[model samples]
Target: CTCVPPHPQTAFCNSDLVIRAKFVGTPEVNQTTLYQRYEIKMTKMYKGFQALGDAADIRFVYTPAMESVCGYFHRRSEEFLIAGKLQDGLLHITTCSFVAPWNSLSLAQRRGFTKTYTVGCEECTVFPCLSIPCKLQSGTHCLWTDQLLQGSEKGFQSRHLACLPREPGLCTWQSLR
Candidate 1:
C-alpha cells in the first residue's frame, strides 16, 4: 500500500491505542470477522486505557486477513511498539499502522513514546520541510528536515530529537542524546 510516511510522533499522537508488547502465541482466522487475530503480551501501554475498561487483560489485536488490504502479516516474536485504533472495543492494526520493533528504535524515539511526544502535542507541531531555505510555520512549529537535509529515510531529527515546548508558546527541537 502507498503512504506518505508519517513522522513517528504523528503516528503516536493519532493512534487510539499505543503499546509496547510482544506478538505471542498464534494467529487465528476469524472467518466471520474476516480478520486475523493475534495474541499480545503487553509490557506497557502508552495510551488507550479507556479501551481496556474493566477488563482483566487485553490479549488480541485484529488485522484484515487479506494481503491486498494491507493486513499486518508479520508475527515477530520480539517486542514491538505498536500504534493503532480501537475499533468496536477491539484494537485493529494494518500494515499502515505504526508498528516498529522495539529493539530497532532509537533512545529518543523510545522516550517519545514513553512521554515527550504527548507533552509536546499539547501545543507543538512537527512539520515536514521538503525544500531548502525553510522556516518554521509558527512559534509552535518545529521544522522536520529529514528529507530536505538528512538525505536518508531515517534521519537524525526523526531519531534523536523531539520538537518540544520550551517557552510559554514556542517550541524547539531538543536532542535527547
Candidate 2:
C-alpha cells in the first residue's frame, strides 16, 4: 500500500526514494516464490503556506518481493510496493539502512572487501530541481545522495540508495549557505 505523488510538481510530491530487500534463502529450481522483506523510503516537501519554514514528510514502504523466488533472470518476477506517509515531522530518519540474508559477518571478510554502489534519480534529468534531504552534524557537509552496496555469495548482492535524482538539493539550501 504505497502512495506516490500523482505529479512531480505537486507540493506533496512523493520523491527522494530508497529501495531495499533481504533474501530469505537460496531458492530451489521450480520454486515459484520465495519470501523476502522489502522497504522503501520517500520524502515529501511542502512550502510554508501554513508554516514559516518548509515541511518534510517521510514515508516507509514495507512488503515482500516474491520475484526472486523465480530467480533473477525470470522476467516479470512478482514484486510488491508498499508506501506510507509521515505527516507529523519535518524529517524522518530510520535507524537501520542495511538488509541482508544473514546478520553476522567475519572481520576478515569485512576488511578485504572492495565494493561500490551507484545511485541516481531515474527522472532527475527531466525534473532538475528535485533534491534529497541532508542534515549536517560536526563538519561542513553537503547532502549528496548515494546508495549502499553489499557483496554476497551466490552472487546475491544488494544495494541501497542505488539511484538518486540529479541536481540534488543543497545542504542548508533553505538556510545557511
Candidate 3:
C-alpha cells in the first residue's frame, strides 16, 4: 500500500542523504544480527555524499521480509530516486522511505530540488548526422551542461549529460550529470 507518497519537500527535509542512480547489478546479501545486510552497487549518484568522491557502493541493512515486515527489494539495472538515512557510518533505507523508480518522478518533485547535485553522466560519444551534422568534431566531446527545470515560481537546476543518437533521428539524454 505504498500510495500517496510524501511531498518532495517533506521527503528531502527528512532524509539525511538523497541519491539518483541505477542499481548496477544485484545486491549482495550478508546475514547480520538484526537485519539482512547488503552491499548495493550504484552508478551515477545525483546527490548527497558530498564529502566522498562518489556514492557507488551503498552499505545497507534492512529487516527480513515477513508477513509483518514491509521489507523492500530494490531491482537491479533500473534507475531510482532514493531517500535514505545515514546511520553507523552507512546509508540505510526502509520501505517507508521515499524510494521510487525514476520513470515515476514528477516535474514538480524534480523542481523541488532547487539547488544542485552532482551526478555521473559523462564519456559518451555522438556521430555526425546527415540531418544535423556535427560541428567542430575535433574537440567536441560529451559532458554535462547546467539546465533549469521549472514549472512554477520555484525551479531546480540539474546537470544533464550529453548523448549520441541511440537510433536514427533520436537522441536520448540522461537526467543527471
Candidate 4:
C-alpha cells in the first residue's frame, strides 16, 4: 500500500484524537476481530474530548490486521505520539496514521500538538504540494512544500514549523516555539 506523507500539523488537524500514550498490552488479532488491537495507557490528551472522555481511561487503538492493508506493528511499553480517528466508537490507527515514537518528535512539534496547531487549525488550512508549480490556494491556505520542494517528507517546515494565521485571513508558517 502507498501513503502520502503528511505534515504534523496536517495530521493533527485531520485526526479525531491526538495523544501521548504508552503501549501497554500485547497486540491482538484473531478470527473474531476485524483489526489488530492494542491497549494504550494515556499520558496526555492533546485533542478529541468527544472521542475520549476527560477521565483518562485505558483505551484500545485498532489497526488493520494485515500489513498489506496498512496495519501498524510495534512492541509494548514504548511511549508514542499517536494521532487517529474514532471509527464506530473505536480509536483506529494505521501505517498512514501519525504514529511516532514520543522521543522522535522535536520540542517544537510537541508544543504545536499541544497548543499552536489547534489554535491555528480553526482558521488555517494546510494543503499538500505533491507536484511542481504549487502555490497558495487562498489567503487562509498554507502550502505544504515537503514534496514539492524537497522531494522528501523530512522537510524543515514539517519538522519545526506550524502554519498559523498571522491576521484575519492570512496564514503563514511560523516556528513552533
Model 2, range 1-177, lDDT digits (tens) per residue?
222222111111232322222322332332243322222232222222234333432233222233322212111122212112233331221212121222232232222111111122223211211244434432222222221112222111111111123253521111100
Q: Name the 10 consecutive residues with the lowest summed lDDT in model 4.
A: 146-155
Residue by residue across 72-153, what tens digits does model 3's lDDT show?
5664455677777776766666656677776666554554443421111223232222233334342322221221113321
Model 4, total clashes: 0
Worst 10 residues of 2 by lDDT: 154-163
Query: What stretches of model 4 exceed 4 Å from their correct place?
Result: 49-54, 75-77, 149-153
User: What are the lDDT figures for the candidates, one per model?
Assistant: 0.80, 0.23, 0.46, 0.82
Off by over 4 Å in 1: 49-56, 130-136, 148-153
Off by over 4 Å in 2: 1-16, 19-54, 65-116, 119-177
Comparing 1 with 2 on TM-score, the higher-scoring candidate is: 1
Number of the top TM-score candidate: 4
TM value for model 1: 0.79
Candidate 2: pairs in clash: 2-83, 119-162, 120-163, 120-164, 121-164, 121-165, 131-169
lDDT of 4 at 35: 93
Q: Whose lDDT is higher: candidate 1's or candidate 4's?
A: 4
Q: After superposing candidate 3 on the true structure, give the runs of residues whose Cα lies further than 4 Å from its correct spot.
A: 1-5, 24-29, 54-67, 114-177
After superposition on all C-alphas, the RMSD of every candidate to the true structure, in Å, is 3.1, 16.0, 15.6, 2.3
